[PDB]
Design a protein around this ligand. Sequence first.
Ligand SMILES: *[C@@H]1O[C@H](CO)[C@@H](O[C@@H]2O[C@H](CO)[C@@H](O[C@@H]3O[C@H](CO)[C@@H](O)[C@H](O)[C@@H]3O)[C@H](O)[C@H]2NC(C)=O)[C@H](O)[C@H]1NC(C)=O
Lengths: 48, 400
Amino acid sequence: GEGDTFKGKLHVPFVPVKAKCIATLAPEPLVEHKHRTLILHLHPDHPT
Amino acid sequence: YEHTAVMPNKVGIPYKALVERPGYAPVHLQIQLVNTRIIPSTNLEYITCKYKTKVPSPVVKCCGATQCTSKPHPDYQCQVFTGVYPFMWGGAYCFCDTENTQMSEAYVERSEECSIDHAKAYKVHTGTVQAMVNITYGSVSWRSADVYVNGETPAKIGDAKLIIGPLSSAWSPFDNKVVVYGHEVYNYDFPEYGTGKAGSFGDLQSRTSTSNDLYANTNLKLQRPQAGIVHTPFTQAPSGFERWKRDKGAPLNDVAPFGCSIALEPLRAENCAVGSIPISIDIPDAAFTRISETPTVSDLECKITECTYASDFGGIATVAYKSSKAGNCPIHSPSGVAVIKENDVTLAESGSFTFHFSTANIHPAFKLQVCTSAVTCKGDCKPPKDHIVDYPAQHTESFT
Ligand SMILES: *[C@@H]1O[C@H](CO)[C@@H](O[C@@H]2O[C@H](CO)[C@@H](O[C@@H]3O[C@H](CO)[C@@H](O)[C@H](O)[C@@H]3O)[C@H](O)[C@H]2NC(C)=O)[C@H](O)[C@H]1NC(C)=O
């Protein structure tokens, strides 16, 4: 419009907030001890 | 009674040592460090976040040009286009096929997510380190002290005062420049305030989240509207904060040496086990008892049983006490090669009682000490059968 910037602040209905989302839980690793060496068996379900 | 000794800086391990005052029953200390907060100095430089290209509605005049003005908006990029013939809604907008002009305006504004999700640069100095310490000495069995590690400033909790530190090593995990993001921190070198290159980190910089003024070097460039359509096409580098959010390095929180954790609350490293602490405590006279009450324990013999070479309490031993009284008698090893499970032991009239210990040498020739007497508990040990353990409790490895 060629005139004035009419005021009036429309509040944003959905602002970001710091909520809590449920995150995935990778399967437990299978440890196997070895002399000064930790053999770790891993079976990921998704890239972790 | 003002006892002074040096204890290695670790969290979970008690440094039980015996305060031997002549003419009185010995009393044994029991210092343990629950927390070891480094707390460097902090100074906020600026806050970075993803921007938002708020483009106001463009102005169009049918015939004749329209010169733009330099608004004070951050990165206010204004440009004029000529020869546009915008169709819109009901047909064409104008018929001045050469005199038609459009003006475009665009300014950068910190996005809504800056309030919640935003990095924070910092500059850090040496600062001052402070710790929580437990001291279950004598018969008191309680402490909750939170204490500065400046050797000038004793903590004065309970009856016994103490001085600890200063720390022997200054290996603060933080580098000169630190950036904090949510639960994570990084030794990134943020460029500066007001010199942020577009695309890289620090493209959008403000002194604080609520600051009205900001600095936006985003290399924003405007484009001519094509085919006569009413819009403001603009070319801009991708968000600098978006970069380094996917190309971040390994956070300090997970690559700090000496097994330190990081926390945001004042910003700190904690549990940072390095070097040694001079610990000095001031035992109140009222905790001592006259030596004529507690047992003397001369003429004793020592025999160890099946000693393991593990980091748990793999050592067991027996002593032939020749007591002068019946009652308790504090027990300790002045030598660091051996460490004792027991805080104390109760003696009948010339009885015999075992204790548990741990060590790290095959043939531990340690002077065991008991209330005003000592014995050489020399023996032999055998290697541990099994590599499966989580944490240790003796760290006295030396020549063997
Ligand atoms: C300072 O060090 C002393 C000595 O290590 C701490 O004493 C011990 O405190 C624990 C709790 O932290 C007591 O645990 C007990 O566990 C059983 C089983 O769950 C429970 O039934 C008891 O109610 C109790 O919680 C433990 O008994 C106690 N030591 C002895 C010999 O009684 C003390 O807590 C430390 N103080 C601080 C503030 O860290």
